[PDB]
Enzyme design. Structure first.
Site, short mmCIF file in Angstrom:
data_model
loop_
_atom_site.label_atom_id
_atom_site.label_comp_id
_atom_site.label_asym_id
_atom_site.label_seq_id
_atom_site.Cartn_x
_atom_site.Cartn_y
_atom_site.Cartn_z
N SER A 15 76.59 -31.56 -33.61
CA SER A 15 77.41 -32.21 -34.64
C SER A 15 78.19 -33.30 -33.94
O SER A 15 78.23 -33.36 -32.71
CB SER A 15 78.41 -31.22 -35.25
OG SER A 15 77.76 -30.22 -36.03
N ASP A 20 74.80 -35.53 -37.40
CA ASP A 20 74.25 -34.33 -36.80
C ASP A 20 72.86 -34.53 -36.24
O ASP A 20 72.03 -35.24 -36.82
CB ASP A 20 74.30 -33.18 -37.81
CG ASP A 20 75.72 -32.67 -38.02
OD1 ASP A 20 76.57 -33.43 -38.54
OD2 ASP A 20 76.01 -31.50 -37.65
N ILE A 21 72.61 -33.91 -35.09
CA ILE A 21 71.33 -34.02 -34.44
C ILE A 21 70.49 -32.79 -34.70
O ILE A 21 70.91 -31.66 -34.45
CB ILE A 21 71.49 -34.20 -32.92
CG1 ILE A 21 72.59 -35.23 -32.62
CG2 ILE A 21 70.16 -34.61 -32.29
CD1 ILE A 21 72.44 -36.55 -33.34
N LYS A 36 68.80 -37.66 -36.38
CA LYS A 36 70.22 -37.70 -36.71
C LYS A 36 70.44 -38.01 -38.18
O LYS A 36 69.93 -39.00 -38.70
CB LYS A 36 70.90 -38.76 -35.84
CG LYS A 36 72.38 -38.94 -36.09
CD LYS A 36 72.83 -40.19 -35.38
CE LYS A 36 74.20 -40.64 -35.86
NZ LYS A 36 74.42 -42.07 -35.48
N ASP A 119 81.48 -45.79 -24.71
CA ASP A 119 81.74 -44.36 -24.69
C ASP A 119 80.93 -43.74 -23.56
O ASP A 119 80.18 -42.79 -23.77
CB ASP A 119 81.38 -43.71 -26.03
CG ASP A 119 81.83 -42.25 -26.12
OD1 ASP A 119 82.94 -41.92 -25.67
OD2 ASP A 119 81.06 -41.42 -26.67
N1 LIG Z 1 67.05 -37.33 -28.20
C1 LIG Z 1 67.61 -36.15 -27.91
N2 LIG Z 1 66.79 -35.18 -27.35
C2 LIG Z 1 67.23 -33.93 -26.97
N3 LIG Z 1 68.57 -33.64 -27.16
C3 LIG Z 1 69.44 -34.59 -27.72
C4 LIG Z 1 68.98 -35.90 -28.13
C5 LIG Z 1 70.13 -36.56 -28.65
C6 LIG Z 1 70.20 -37.88 -29.24
O1 LIG Z 1 69.41 -37.77 -30.46
C7 LIG Z 1 69.41 -38.81 -31.39
C8 LIG Z 1 68.39 -39.04 -32.42
C9 LIG Z 1 68.49 -40.19 -33.32
C10 LIG Z 1 69.62 -41.10 -33.17
C11 LIG Z 1 70.56 -40.77 -32.12
CL1 LIG Z 1 71.93 -41.55 -31.59
C12 LIG Z 1 70.50 -39.70 -31.26
N4 LIG Z 1 71.13 -35.73 -28.54
N5 LIG Z 1 70.74 -34.61 -28.02
C13 LIG Z 1 71.62 -33.51 -27.75
C14 LIG Z 1 72.35 -32.99 -28.99
C15 LIG Z 1 73.30 -31.87 -28.69
O2 LIG Z 1 74.22 -32.31 -27.69
C16 LIG Z 1 73.71 -32.85 -26.44
C17 LIG Z 1 72.63 -33.90 -26.67
#
Ligand SMILES: Nc1ncnc2c1c(COc1cccc(Cl)c1)nn2C1CCOCC1
Length: 284
Positions: A15, A20-21, A36, A119
């Site tokens: 979150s 949210d991812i 997201k 950031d």
């Molecule tokens: N690609 C990823 N592959 C594995 N893990 C991931 C990510 C991302 C970014 O994902 C996106 C997707 C679409 C747009 C955006 Cl900005 C970000 N974040 N995380 C985790 C989430 C929980 O906390 C720590 C990192």
């Protein structure tokens, strides 16, 4: 729920003020992916213009899926903050120097393409997957922004009275002051993260703060009373030279990335480290 016609949604992994991812997949090919969801684009401009860069994640699909805004990017690995915990929040000097070279390079890449991250922190740096396992990736959730015109290259105007953007713990001193951020700031933040990996926590961390505001207030105060030489006491001078250099930069100044990278490779050389590229977490 099936989104973007070919992506199946999945378990939510995180979150954030950003949205949210969710983990998800491609019904067609079957490639694990990250998605997201945002309540019905500025991040999109950053990604499609950082496309192709080393350590810049690929966006596979952008758009609205009903009431939400979607973004699908390749799946990545753990974040440096996760790995930091995996290693008892203690990183060897070598791993710190290894990471320092890559992280400076990502930032310079973003900068060469008219953007500032805003950031920079452990949590926004994720390791690659598979054979891209030793590659550090940088992720933007929405704070990235142009700092110059893509065409003319005119640097954005100086500005004060701006509210804290990005995480307080790693913010540059001028950011705390309400000053418009620029390249120098992305670098300074990186300075604190590097010290954070050496110490295990910054001295302005976990400050007894009754309320949010008093919190950013105490941190800002503790950060401005902690002299660099005190913050980096007991560690190689390079960290002091790094922080001092960044804090010296003018608002619209173009950083000397190679000087900074070299600052740490001269130190790498002098420690006598083996050039075996292995981070702490892939070791016993
Ligand atoms: N690609 C990823 N592959 C594995 N893990 C991931 C990510 C991302 C970014 O994902 C996106 C997707 C679409 C747009 C955006 Cl900005 C970000 N974040 N995380 C985790 C989430 C929980 O906390 C720590 C990192």
């Amino acid at each position: 729920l099936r989104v973007g016609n070919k992506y199946r949604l999945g378990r939510k992994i995180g979150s954030g003020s950003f949205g949210d991812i969710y983990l998800g997949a491609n019904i067609a090919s079957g490639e694990e992916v990250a998605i997201k969801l945002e309540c019905v684009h500025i991040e999109s401009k950053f990604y499609k213009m950082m496309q192709g860069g080393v350590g810049i994640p690929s966006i596979k699909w952008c758009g609205a899926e009903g009431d939400y805004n979607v973004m699908v990017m390749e799946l990545l690995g753990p974040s440096l903050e996760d790995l930091f915990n995996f290693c008892s929040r203690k990183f060897s000097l070598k791993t710190v120097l290894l990471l320092a070279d890559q992280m400076i390079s990502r930032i310079e890449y973003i900068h060469s393409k008219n953007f500032i991250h805003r950031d920079v922190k452990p949590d926004n740096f994720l390791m690659g997957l598979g054979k891209k396992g030793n590659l550090v990736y940088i992720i933007d959730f929405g704070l990235a922004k142009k700092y110059r015109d893509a065409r003319t290259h005119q640097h954005i105007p100086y500005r004060e009275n701006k509210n804290l953007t990005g995480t307080a713990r790693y913010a540059s001193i001028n950011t705390h002051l309400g000053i418009e951020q620029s390249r120098r700031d992305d670098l300074e933040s990186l300075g604190y993260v590097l010290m954070y990996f050496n110490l295990g926590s910054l001295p302005w961390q976990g400050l007894k703060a009754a309320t949010k505001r008093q919190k950013y207030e105490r941190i800002s105060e503790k950060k401005m009373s902690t002299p660099i030489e005190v913050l980096c006491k007991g560690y190689p001078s390079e960290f002091s030279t790094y922080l001092n250099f960044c804090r010296s930069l003018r608002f619209d100044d173009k950083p000397d990335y190679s000087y900074l990278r070299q600052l740490f490779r001269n130190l790498f050389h002098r420690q006598g480290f083996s050039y075996d590229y292995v981070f702490d977490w892939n070791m016993l």
